[PDB]
Amino acid sequence: AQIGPVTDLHITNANISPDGFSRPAVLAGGTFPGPTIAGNTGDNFQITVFNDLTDPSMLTDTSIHWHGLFQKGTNWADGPAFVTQCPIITGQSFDYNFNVPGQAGTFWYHSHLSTQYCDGLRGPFVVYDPNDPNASLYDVDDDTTIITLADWYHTLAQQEPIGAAITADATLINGLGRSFTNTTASPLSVITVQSGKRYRMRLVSISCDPNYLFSIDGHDMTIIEVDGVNSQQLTVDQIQIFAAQRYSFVLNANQPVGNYWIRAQPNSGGQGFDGGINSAILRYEGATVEDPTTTAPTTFSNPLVETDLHPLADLGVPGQPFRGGADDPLVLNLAFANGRFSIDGVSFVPPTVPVLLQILSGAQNAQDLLPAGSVISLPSNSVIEVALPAGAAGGPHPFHLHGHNFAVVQSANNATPNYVNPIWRDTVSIGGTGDNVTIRFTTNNPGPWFLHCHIDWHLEAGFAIVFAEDIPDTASANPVPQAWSDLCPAYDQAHNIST
Numbered sequence: 001a002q003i004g005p006v007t008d009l010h011i012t013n014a015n016i017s018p019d020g021f022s023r024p025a026v027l028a029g030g031t032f033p034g035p036t037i038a039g040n041t042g043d044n045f046q047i048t049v050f051n052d053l054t055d056p057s058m059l060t061d062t063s064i065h066w067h068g069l070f071q072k073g074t075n076w077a078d079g080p081a082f083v084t085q086c087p088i089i090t091g092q093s094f095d096y097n098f099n100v101p102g103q104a105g106t107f108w109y110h111s112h113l114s115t116q117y118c119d120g121l122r123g124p125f126v127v128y129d130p131n132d133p134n135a136s137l138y139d140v141d142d143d144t145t146i147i148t149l150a151d152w153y154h155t156l157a158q159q160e161p162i163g164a165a166i167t168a169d170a171t172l173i174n175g176l177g178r179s180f181t182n183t184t185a186s187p188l189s190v191i192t193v194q195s196g197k198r199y200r201m202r203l204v205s206i207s208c209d210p211n212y213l214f215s216i217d218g219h220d221m222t223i224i225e226v227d228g229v230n231s232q233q234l235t236v237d238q239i240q241i242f243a244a245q246r247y248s249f250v251l252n253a254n255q256p257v258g259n260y261w262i263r264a265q266p267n268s269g270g271q272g273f274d275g276g277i278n279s280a281i282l283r284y285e286g287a288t289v290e291d292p293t294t295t296a297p298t299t300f301s302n303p304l305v306e307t308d309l310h311p312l313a314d315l316g317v318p319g320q321p322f323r324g325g326a327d328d329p330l331v332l333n334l335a336f337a338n339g340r341f342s343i344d345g346v347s348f349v350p351p352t353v354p355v356l357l358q359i360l361s362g363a364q365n366a367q368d369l370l371p372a373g374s375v376i377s378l379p380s381n382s383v384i385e386v387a388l389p390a391g392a393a394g395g396p397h398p399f400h401l402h403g404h405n406f407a408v409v410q411s412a413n414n415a416t417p418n419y420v421n422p423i424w425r426d427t428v429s430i431g432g433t434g435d436n437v438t439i440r441f442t443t444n445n446p447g448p449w450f451l452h453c454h455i456d457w458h459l460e461a462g463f464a465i466v467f468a469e470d471i472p473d474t475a476s477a478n479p480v481p482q483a484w485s486d487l488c489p490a491y492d493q494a495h496n497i498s499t
Ligand SMILES: *[C@@H]1O[C@H](CO)[C@@H](O[C@@H]2O[C@H](CO)[C@@H](O[C@@H]3O[C@H](CO)[C@@H](O)[C@H](O)[C@@H]3O)[C@H](O)[C@H]2NC(C)=O)[C@H](O)[C@H]1NC(C)=O
Pocket: 323, 324, 329, 330, 331, 387, 389, 434, 435, 436, 438
């Protein structure tokens, strides 16, 4: 069952074996992935998060981010530790109480403390639209049509060297999959469809690192949503999905009744499908209960290319149709050396006082804010352009901005910008050497918004900056509840920190 929009959510430790290997984890709702949190557009969500964690090897503190939800007027509820809150300590709870005006689509939630979400705290978050403009394109859209793609590690996250190339041990599709080494024939996930029906498959990358080449043997996929943004219909036979991205696609159950492989090939870790790694099963009602015998093609003839996507609505692009054609045009210098990432020469290390609390205490320019050199102020009611030229080791890096979606004016592997009708999204691959992926948005949401690579190991190694958007209006725009004001005293007391 789905839970929400008003619900408790318990965060616990437990042993799980999603690939046949047992390890302890950090779980929401007792499962991996966590339960789907759902509601309708414009609803009030009140997710009362109970931190019941006791195993220090995966951290006993926590904080949860609602990925892709703008949090306008509720920056305090966004979740990134030491940006918008101090962590929730064990034995305490915290009500994330916010609204989702003007958004409908496929989202997710995850820990936003250190690398904790890799240890299991990740789940889907769906905001349905009772008047969805895409409703007539499918018959079925429910918890059974959500498809999660996850990397899974046998080593606990707090034992992964910082700045290292860290590699997974299994791909999990809907929480199940087989290990790349010492492979055992553990259960594969089954997605069941009825011949002749059309399904809104909600594809969610809950990855900590790899991107996946996703396909379904014998089927194609008609994209209708990208990171919460409705798209024109685009039919593809493969989707390369980077960490934290989402797509909705229509699956037409129009092939013979039978069993078909669902494939998710990561860019690192196990290659291919030997022993049923990187796999799940599409089963038609009435098919024999047996593994598929289908083949992938050698090459995919209609892969997704990001510049082929266009919004369903006339969203346009803010600003002027040339590089630098914005009120506040930025170019970030994105680098890696010696185990640490940097942005504009500064490696991110979380501050002791959350950025939002520094601003509410009266710090009002970005040079007064800690960490020094990690906070960039943005002016209010202005067009922002951010160029993100690639080249730093460990790519391709999927960059994500909190508080906002953005027009993708220039995509990976294509030097041509689009100032007319690019897709809007919230997490974008910045590509390869010599690329100049560029985003634009307008500043109508006061508060400190994280910008970072969504490969969680990279964030931990410093690949982040904070956009302090409209510092002067942050306090009036974001009134804070007493329970939020209580978090930093409680946290600092528990950890013997003075501030
Ligand atoms: C990606 O696109 C951005 C624009 O969105 C390019 O930024 C431009 O970069 C050049 C330097 O590479 C800048 O010109 C330089 O400016 C300094 C003065 O600040 C001057 O001392 C240098 O002689 C040179 O003129 C320019 O200001 C900047 N912005 C623009 C053109 O709008 C960036 O180079 C592109 N990166 C890649 C890898 O393609």
